[PDB]
Design a protein around this ligand. Structure first.
Ligand SMILES: *[C@@H]1O[C@H](CO)[C@@H](O[C@@H]2O[C@H](CO)[C@@H](O)[C@H](O)[C@H]2NC(C)=O)[C@H](O)[C@H]1NC(C)=O
Ligand SMILES: *[C@@H]1O[C@H](CO)[C@@H](O[C@@H]2O[C@H](CO)[C@@H](O)[C@H](O)[C@H]2NC(C)=O)[C@H](O)[C@H]1NC(C)=O
Ligand SMILES: *[C@@H]1O[C@H](CO)[C@@H](O[C@@H]2O[C@H](CO)[C@@H](O)[C@H](O)[C@H]2NC(C)=O)[C@H](O)[C@H]1NC(C)=O
Ligand SMILES: CCCCc1nc2c(N)nc3ccccc3c2n1Cc1ccc(CN)cc1
Ligand SMILES: CCCCc1nc2c(N)nc3ccccc3c2n1Cc1ccc(CN)cc1
Ligand SMILES: *[C@@H]1O[C@H](CO)[C@@H](O)[C@H](O)[C@H]1NC(C)=O
Ligand SMILES: *[C@@H]1O[C@H](CO)[C@@H](O)[C@H](O)[C@H]1NC(C)=O
Ligand SMILES: *[C@@H]1O[C@H](CO)[C@@H](O)[C@H](O)[C@H]1NC(C)=O
Ligand SMILES: *[C@@H]1O[C@H](CO)[C@@H](O)[C@H](O)[C@H]1NC(C)=O
Ligand SMILES: *[C@@H]1O[C@H](CO)[C@@H](O)[C@H](O)[C@H]1NC(C)=O
Ligand SMILES: *[C@@H]1O[C@H](CO)[C@@H](O)[C@H](O)[C@H]1NC(C)=O
Ligand SMILES: *[C@@H]1O[C@H](CO)[C@@H](O)[C@H](O)[C@H]1NC(C)=O
Ligand SMILES: *[C@@H]1O[C@H](CO)[C@@H](O)[C@H](O)[C@H]1NC(C)=O
Ligand SMILES: *[C@@H]1O[C@H](CO)[C@@H](O)[C@H](O)[C@H]1NC(C)=O
Ligand SMILES: *[C@@H]1O[C@H](CO)[C@@H](O)[C@H](O)[C@H]1NC(C)=O
Ligand SMILES: *[C@@H]1O[C@H](CO)[C@@H](O)[C@H](O)[C@H]1NC(C)=O
Lengths: 774, 773
RNA sequence: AUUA
RNA sequence: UUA
């Protein structure tokens, strides 16, 4: 169905609306720009390769190029591969770009360059040079960038990529860049705010540098500035997980009280890790539009209790005051100044790392009438005592986050303590349910109904990762009449009573995963038929519980649709000869998705499929060490659409898959030991739409196994990483792969000959087999 | 160095003292008995193969055989592999054994046999027929076994291997076996004690059967019986993890009170899981030698508070009363009868699964004067309250076991609840002194007062509790002699570097799986807490997810072993951050360092220089190491063991001599090594163990493997490679065939991948004569 | 899990 | 392989 097979090792794509032809050669182990790129190419990406040089021949025929992404073909020593270090800088020969008359965006990050490349076309609006070795900016080297609007020069001199001197910027270096909207000089060992900057600036990024003082007039003209980030000049270095040098004498970044006067358009101000001890109200006299303010990682512990500056910020949406605690101090309580009540627009307030023993309801009173408040984040505060009923005055909130505290009777895992949370890479929850009380990672070991008094409004409660080691009998959550999602994972649930959780009469999702403790000790009673009582439960997760025994023999539900039962011991419950648990899931009448991967099921006893509930659609048996599989038994599963058998030990496929399942749509067989396909494998498998045979040991595929009326249905067909043998016997397969319309990922990189000798390591897509036709 | 290569796929071994020639073909995927077994062979083992038949030709020349182990060549369907089910029972032709005039032991278990193989020699003393399909014993079929002493007939009819009828035994079938010492009829669907039995019996095993009643005289003559197991007749089925059918009418196994009268020599009596509700003293009137008595898995809850029968047991060493609780009852406390005080000889007492809320010192008083008591096991009792100071009255004990309870302010994991704990297969801190095992409880806070009066303790097990606390050294004051502290699986918060410093006798500390507080950014961790513990030998901090540390050095002048696996040294040693490159340098006496599973895809320069000076055994396994500067091994001047298994290395050093000139054991299994450097092992004279298995090597030439270096080797592992058996391979193939050096799996996984002709062929059998024409 |  |  293809007259000319695609041989270029890049994903080519057409967006005819925007007349873009996209050529993506990301990470193709290329040592030169591959030949045969479409001359109509607009966007060409060549990141993560080892192309040693660029020359006029590089883009010679590609005169329609709007964007060139040529990053990380020589990433600096400490940043890149240690197995494949780049030997020498990328070389850009003269005139390599001057011919690309339409080029608007040029990325040359991560190539160890020493200087701003010259000869760039005046069409250019974005130039990116992060992670190079350019640490001295001269106004002459910038003349060529007249029409530039976006300029990234950061990460060219910092601990992971040192230049061993200060960053140097000539006076007015940037001033004649009259269209410059975004200037990024982060992570560069800069020592003063470069001046004068063009008043066209909208975004200025100066963070993680060596700037100790702001001059009064450093931002005098930037009356279009919207984002200003000065974070990490004079850093707070306590528990920093990267090398950190503070300003002498514990000095803060010194900011004159009038330094922001010109910034009437400022929407974002970031002063993270600037070791500040005061926030002068004078700063915000002529900024009335500020929406986002980060003051995390300073020394504002006392200022939080005063905080007059908040009276000047009526339009503020986000305020972050996290990690301002005084060292070695465990405060008794949280002193929140009354000034917080003047933050009429506040949607998000974050005060992690204040560190205090006891939170009591009045202390949050400055917040009571903040009508727009959606998120209150008091995590990582070592709170020991908290009456949860105080949040009855915060029903309007979407998330109350008390994660990581010591209470007893989304942001990244590493966020406040990383070096550059916004660093670019070489390539490129229950909040939905309503009000959420996150109590995860606390010290709750016993819960009683009263603990939730006055919180009937809660829709999701996260008790994950506490110490609850208790038999729940339905009396513990009584007030939570509207709860839809309970995350109870990483506790020590003791399912003695089949009335556990039955008081949560609106519960749709229940996670009791990683509660393996009591299931790990022999002879203890576990009631798995507790599902009968939850009449609107859709989804149950009981993964990684080590379940090997069960007092009850069947689980019952008239509502349950998804059961995650992964990481347990169904091999033990279904031990050959023991018939008592073969219908464990049969009475989950509405169940459509069953995950019983990672259950040590090296074989499936007869009765397992007959015992499945009648509407099972999607079944995972992955990661089981399955050594054998009687495919005929799929006939029992009359609504089976997806079968995941990945990461097992299967060595054969069924003789005729049609004769096994008349419903099967998605068959996943990846990472098995299959060495050949049956003669008529896919014959009349008219329902088949997705087939993954990748990561096996297949040598040959004949036409009988792959009828073309079945292959034209297939949305995807995975074959990479097999042991394909490219003799003349393989002529049909090699022809078909090269000429097929079917989607086959990784033809450029992992559909390969193992032999014979002559062809080893060669791609099947490039194979020439004419010698078989003489 | 060998003139005739061994080609037999069996390990041949000679113990000339007992003039035994042992030939072990266990699990060699054999479909016939290999030819060429040494004629002098004594023990021949052929278990786990697929030999379909035995015939007179089988052992024709092997007339010196004392033992034949021929088990599991046709395992019953539900017991064996389901990927390779045996298609048809093993077939034993007439005369197969009559010629083996010296044959004393014959194992034919797990072969799906239907009948007792006949024609056995009169020399035979042990016959084993477990896991076959023999469920009818006839006295006629037993004549040939005149001189037999050990006879195993169990597992021929049970849930995993059903026969669908009752087991049948003709009367006096065993009586003329005048030398018969041990008879095992376990797991057999037996319905009465077979009679009469030969009085020569010492061990009789009838457990897991369908015996509903013992007759008065069933054991009348067995006055040499030493062990009797009747367990699992009328079983207690509550929470049984196997199919379990109780005796009707909630009846127990009925034993008339005089049934044991003849059993004067009985040392062990096992009545586990017989649904008993009473233990009549009359049973034990004429046994005073009893040492071991199992009464677990009955219904003796009340009888434990009465227990008159114990007065008849002054010689008893072990007593097990575990899992007698009455269903649905959570007693307030443990009523132990005073009769326990009469167990003058008792060393081990076990009462798991009594199930009661509060244990207090008075309940244990009957135990106060049992001077020989060594073990008290009160686990799985759901105890909520226990003043631990009550054990001040038990300093003499070796183990006080409160594992798996609900306390708050070794036996196999499955033991009391398995079907047959003694079934045959087809093939700790106690040492340190008094041990208080509190593992798997609900302790969430520790204060010094909790250990008042327990200074005698040597090992304290707190593993698997809920301790989520900063220890400042004030929590363990009374434990002045503690040598072993297991604190794993808790939530230790190392805020204070004075943690544990009060335990000034601590030699080993496990704080593994205390990852909780290490998982959350910005929290202070003091890893230099080791400085205060002046006698600490072994520190385990495995699986803690440590990625950050306020302190930059760990300090100890005593510590010799540090387990640091499952952490994030990749983050602490992030390229460009030099501050933790000497984390371990001042562990001056450290000899063993485990930093496997640390995501170290590379080792930054400085890591090796930062190692302490006496490092002997260093594991970098399971790290995804893609690259390794072998030269930097020069810094490690005392390195004896280097474990680099399960990584992504593609090369070995150009000269291992020039890298480490002490290295004895180099482990490189499961990597991506495709070829050896030309002069690899040249002059590496101290090397004694080399594992290159599970790599992708195609060729090995003599340059890389000089023979003055390979004869050094205690072992040399090469299996699961990609060996190419062309004429280029002539030296390697010759050396493998003729070497004395031990190379495991030569029979089964040292294989040519090619070329074509030789694909899948064993290197040991390879004929390369065409290369010499 | 090739007698658990 | 800019975190
Ligand atoms: C950032 O700038 C500082 C000073 O401008 C550099 O520090 C010097 O580094 C050299 C070489 O390591 C030392 O010999 C000097 O003592 C340092 N001078 C001062 C004043 O500290 C630093 O190396 C620069 N580069 C970075 C941090 O990557
Ligand atoms: C070789 O076979 C003999 C005979 O089966 C084994 O010797 C027996 O070992 C037990 C162990 O205590 C003794 O009770 C028997 O009396 C021995 N038989 C005798 C002495 O005739 C021997 O263990 C086997 N050796 C190996 C290595 O398999
Ligand atoms: C143990 O023996 C009993 C007989 O007492 C077997 O039970 C019979 O099994 C067949 C087939 O399942 C039934 O049709 C009979 O009705 C049963 N008879 C009785 C009296 O129950 C039992 O199967 C045997 N057990 C094993 C494991 O072989
Ligand atoms: C974000 C705070 C980082 C420093 C820190 N680390 C810890 C820690 N591991 N455990 C604690 C436990 C209770 C209170 C505070 C801390 C604490 N703290 C805060 C703190 C530490 C020490 C002191 C002095 N006792 C007061 C407060
Ligand atoms: C050896 C024990 C097997 C049965 C069992 N299972 C559990 C369990 N999962 N949690 C408990 C928690 C507290 C007390 C008893 C049990 C218990 N128990 C004992 C028990 C169960 C049920 C009752 C009835 N209230 C009393 C006592
Ligand atoms: C293509 O490049 C243009 C110009 O830089 C850019 O605006 C657009 O987002 C790119 N599109 C794709 C799909 O790469
Ligand atoms: C909070 O602290 C500020 C100064 O830090 C002080 O003005 C105020 O009175 C304090 N309020 C309370 C309730 O402690
Ligand atoms: C918690 O506060 C609520 C009122 O919001 C009150 O009803 C309850 O008694 C308090 N509980 C405790 C333990 O202080
Ligand atoms: C609950 O919190 C844990 C840890 O904070 C998190 O992993 C989990 O995804 C949360 N649950 C939901 C339902 O968001
Ligand atoms: C459930 O347990 C709670 C607390 O242990 C108790 O108050 C309540 O009476 C129990 N309910 C039932 C039905 O047993
Ligand atoms: C669960 O099963 C047990 C019997 O195994 C029964 O006692 C209990 O009442 C059942 N509970 C429910 C809710 O079905
Ligand atoms: C089937 O379920 C798995 C979860 O086990 C999910 O990841 C997958 O996308 C599902 N497939 C379909 C077609 O619903
Ligand atoms: C498979 O083929 C047989 C032979 O005709 C047919 O009777 C049977 O119904 C088929 N099974 C399915 C599931 O189509
Ligand atoms: C402590 O108890 C745990 C849990 O029972 C056990 O795994 C561990 O081996 C024990 N520690 C020692 C040192 O014996
Ligand atoms: C350690 O802390 C405990 C717990 O509060 C306290 O009892 C003790 O005074 C402290 N000891 C030292 C030496 O700091
Ligand atoms: C551990 O090191 C830290 C330095 O980060 C220091 O504060 C503390 O006193 C040290 N303690 C010991 C016992 O070495």
């Amino acid at each position: 169905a293809r007259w000319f097979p695609k041989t270029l090792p890049c994903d080519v794509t057409l967006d005819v609306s925007k007349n873009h032809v996209i050529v993506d050669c990301t990470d193709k182990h290329l040592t030169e720009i591959p030949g045969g790129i479409p001359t109509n190419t607009t966007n060409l990406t060549l990141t993560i390769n080892h192309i040693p040089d660029i020359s006029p021949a590089s883009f010679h025929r590609l005169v329609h190029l709007v964007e060139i992404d040529f990053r990380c073909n020589c990433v600096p020593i400490r940043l890149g591969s240690k197995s494949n270090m780049c030997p020498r800088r990328l070389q850009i020969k003269p005139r390599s770009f001057s011919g690309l008359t339409y080029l608007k965006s040029l990325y040359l990050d991560g190539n160890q360059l020493l200087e701003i490349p010259q000869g760039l076309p005046p069409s250019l609006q974005l130039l990116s040079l992060e992670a190079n070795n350019i640490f001295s900016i001269r106004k002459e080297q910038l003349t060529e960038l007249a029409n530039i609007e976006i300029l990234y020069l950061g990460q060219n001199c910092y601990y992971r990529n040192p230049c061993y001197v200060s960053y140097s910027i000539e006076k007015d270096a940037f001033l004649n860049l009259t269209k410059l909207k975004v200037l990024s000089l982060k992570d560069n060992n800069v020592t003063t705010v470069p001046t004068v900057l063009p008043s066209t600036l909208t975004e200025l990024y100066l963070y993680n540098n060596m700037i100790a003082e702001i001059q009064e007039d450093d931002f005098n003209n930037l009356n279009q500035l919207q984002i200003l980030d000065l974070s990490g000049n004079c850093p707070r270095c306590y528990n920093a997980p990267f090398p950190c040098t503070p300003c002498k004498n514990n000095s803060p970044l010194q900011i004159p009280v009038n330094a922001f006067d010109a910034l009437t358009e400022l929407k974002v101000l970031r002063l993270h890790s600037n070791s500040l001890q005061h926030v002068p109200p004078r700063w915000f006299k002529n900024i009335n539009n500020l929406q986002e303010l980060d003051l995390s990682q300073n020394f504002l512990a006392k200022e939080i209790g005063d905080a007059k500056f908040l009276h000047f910020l009526p339009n503020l949406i986000q305020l972050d005051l996290s990690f301002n605690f005084e060292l070695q101090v465990y405060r008794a309580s949280m002193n929140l100044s009354q000034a917080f009540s003047s933050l009429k627009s506040l949607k998000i307030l974050r005060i992690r790392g204040y560190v205090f023993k006891e939170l009591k309801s009045f202390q949050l009173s400055p917040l009571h009438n903040l009508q727009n408040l959606e998120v209150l984040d008091l995590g990582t505060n070592f709170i020991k005592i908290a009456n949860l009923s105080m949040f009855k005055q915060f029903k309007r909130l979407k998330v109350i986050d008390l994660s990581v505290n010591k209470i007893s009777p989304v942001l990244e895992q590493l966020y406040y303590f990383r070096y550059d949370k916004y660093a670019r890479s070489c390539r490129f929850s229950c909040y939905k349910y309503g009000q959420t009380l996150d109590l995860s990672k606390n010290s709750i070991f016993f819960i009683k109904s009263s603990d939730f008094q006055h919180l009937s409004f809660l829709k999701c409660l996260n008790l994950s990762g506490n110490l609850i080691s208790q038999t729940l009998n339905g009396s513990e959550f009584q007030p939570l009449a509207e709860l839809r999602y309970l995350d109870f994972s990483n506790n020590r649930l003791d399912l003695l009573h089949s009335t556990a959780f039955e008081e949560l009469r609106k519960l749709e999702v229940l996670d009791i995963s990683s509660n393996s403790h009591y299931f790990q000790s022999e002879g203890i009673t576990h009631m798995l038929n507790f599902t009968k009582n939850l009449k609107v439960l859709q989804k149950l997760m009981m993964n990684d519980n080590d379940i090997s025994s069960s007092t009850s023999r069947t689980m019952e539900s008239e509502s349950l649709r998804t059961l995650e039962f992964r990481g347990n011991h169904l091999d033990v419950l279904w031990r050959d000869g023991d018939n008592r648990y073969l219908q464990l899931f049969k009475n989950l009448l509405k169940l459509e998705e069953l995950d019983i991967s990672k259950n040590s099921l090296s074989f499936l006893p007869s009765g397992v499929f007959d015992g499945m509930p009648p509407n099972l659609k999607n079944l995972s048996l992955a990661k089981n060490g399955l050594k054998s599989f009687i495919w005929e038994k799929l006939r029992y599963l009359k609504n089976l659409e997806t079968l995941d058998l990945s990461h097992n030990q299967l060595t054969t496929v069924p003789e005729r898959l049609s004769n096994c399942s008349r419903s099967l749509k998605n068959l996943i067989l990846k990472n098995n030991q299959i060495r050949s396909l049956t003669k008529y494998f896919l014959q009349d498998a008219f329902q088949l739409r997705y087939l993954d045979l990748s990561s096996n040991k297949i040598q040959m595929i004949q036409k009988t196994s792959f009828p073309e009326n079945v292959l034209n249905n297939l949305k995807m067909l995975l074959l990479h990483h097999n042991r394909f043998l490219c003799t003349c016997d393989a002529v049909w397969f090699v022809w078909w792969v090269q000429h097929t319309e079917v989607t086959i990922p990784y033809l450029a990189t992992d559909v390969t000959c193992v032999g014979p000798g002559a062809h080893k390591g060669q791609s099947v897509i490039s194979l020439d087999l004419y010698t078989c036709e003489l």
